[PDB]
């Protein structure tokens, strides 16, 4: 089922030491250099299917701090909507953790209704799908108080 036909990229977790290393990810087929950021998992709206502004949540990093990569759960809405919504909230990149343990998948763009078509052309933030294992590892680091920093490389596209 061409289940290993994904365009994979590498990312690097640079901290904490417990989970530091190189991990495979799959860049979204939408949007699109190296970018270092720090990962945040929101306490609400964790699938990024509704506007973060309804929650008064912003991921805009303060001057002098690292850009925010928002960790989002797969499910309930299109991947492209998750990226758009994370982008509207000021995130510098989105990491979508797969909801099941499986080979990486490619986030594809849907065919939308006429009234919901124009946002597809306006997605700019880097978007990557990561495994449930890595998502779970990052969430565990964050819940214990660690800073999770990450370098994204999309030169491989």
């Amino acid at each position: 089922g061409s289940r290993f036909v994904v365009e994979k990229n590498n990312l690097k977790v640079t901290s904490p030491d417990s989970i530091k290393g190189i991990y495979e990810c799959a860049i979204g087929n939408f949007g699109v250099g190296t970018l270092v950021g720090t990962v945040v998992y929101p306490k609400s709206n964790q699938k990024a299917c509704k506007s973060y502004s309804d929650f008064d949540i912003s991921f805009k990093s303060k001057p002098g701090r690292l850009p925010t990569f928002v960790l989002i759960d797969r499910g309930d809405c299109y991947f492209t909507l998750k990226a758009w919504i994370a982008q509207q909230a000021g995130a510098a990149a989105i990491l979508v953790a797969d909801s099941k343990a499986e080979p990486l998948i490619t986030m594809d763009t849907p065919e939308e209704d006429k009234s919901d078509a124009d946002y597809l052309q306006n997605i700019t933030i880097p978007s990557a799908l990561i495994t449930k294992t890595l998502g779970d590892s990052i969430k565990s680091a964050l819940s214990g108080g660690d800073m999770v920093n990450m370098k994204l490389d999309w030169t491989e596209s």
């Binding site: 061409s2 289940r3 087929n29 797969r74 299109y78 594809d108 763009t109 849907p110």
Partner: peptide, 5 residues
């Protein structure tokens, strides 16, 4: 392996 959701 392409998925919309």
């Amino acid at each position: 392996s392409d998925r919309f959701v």
